[PDB]
Curated annotation (Swiss-Prot):
It comes from the Eukaryota. It is found in: Cytoplasm; Endomembrane system; Cell junction; Cell junction, Tight junction. Adapter protein involved in asymmetrical cell division and cell polarization processes. Seems to play a central role in the formation of epithelial tight junctions. Association with PARD6B may prevent the interaction of PARD3 with F11R/JAM1, thereby preventing tight junction assembly. The PARD6-PARD3 complex links GTP-bound Rho small GTPases to atypical protein kinase C proteins. Required for establishment of neuronal polarity and normal axon formation in cultured hippocampal neurons. Involved in Schwann cell peripheral myelination. Targets the phosphatase PTEN to cell junctions. Transmembrane segments: none annotated. This is Partitioning defective 3 homolog. The gene is Pard3. Contains a conserved N-terminal oligomerization domain (NTD) that is involved in oligomerization and is essential for proper subapical membrane localization. Acetylated. Deacetylated by SIRT2, thereby inhibiting Schwann cell peripheral myelination. Belongs to the PAR3 family. Isoform 1 is predominantly expressed in lung, glandular stomach, prostate, ovary and uterus. Isoform 1 is also expressed in brain, with a high expression in the cortex, hippocampus and in the striatum. Isoform 2 is predominantly expressed in intestinal epithelial cells, kidney and prostate. The modification Phosphoserine is found at S27. Component of a complex whose core is composed of ARHGAP17, AMOT, PALS1, PATJ and PARD3/PAR3. Interacts (via PDZ 1 domain) with PARD6A, PARD6B and F11R/JAM1. Interacts with AURKA, AURKB and SIRT2. Interacts with PRKCI. Interacts with PRKCZ. Part of a complex with PARD6A or PARD6B, PRKCI or PRKCZ and CDC42 or RAC1. Interacts with LIMK2 and CDH5. Component of the Par polarity complex, composed of at least phosphorylated PRKCZ, PARD3 and TIAM1. Directly interacts with TIAM1 and TIAM2. Interacts with ECT2 and FBF1. Interacts (via PDZ 3 domain) with PTEN (via C-terminus).
Length: 85
């Protein structure tokens, strides 16, 4: 099977299936962020400051480390960001 990680934006969980899995966190954040606003019924009107990601309580995720190295098949992640809603 392919890669798959869930990115919980504040109070919204969004699944992100990686075809190969070789996608840097930075690419995962941008992909999740876009899907987040599109999933929450939002649009490119309010600002969104994506701080960083975290596995939970022992596995932070920054925009540079590969997914296969950080994320894991069917793994959840807490996304901390800002939003002017």
């Amino acid at each position: 099977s392919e890669f798959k990680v869930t990115v919980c934006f504040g109070r919204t969980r969004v699944d992100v299936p990686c075809g190969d899995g070789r996608m840097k966190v930075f690419s995962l954040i941008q992909q999740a962020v876009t899907r987040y606003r599109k999933a929450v019924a939002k649009d490119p009107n309010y600002w969104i400051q994506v701080h960083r990601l975290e596995h939970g309580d022992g596995g932070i995720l920054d925009l540079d480390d590969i997914l296969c190295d950080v994320a894991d098949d069917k793994d959840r992640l807490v996304a901390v960001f800002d939003e002017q809603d």
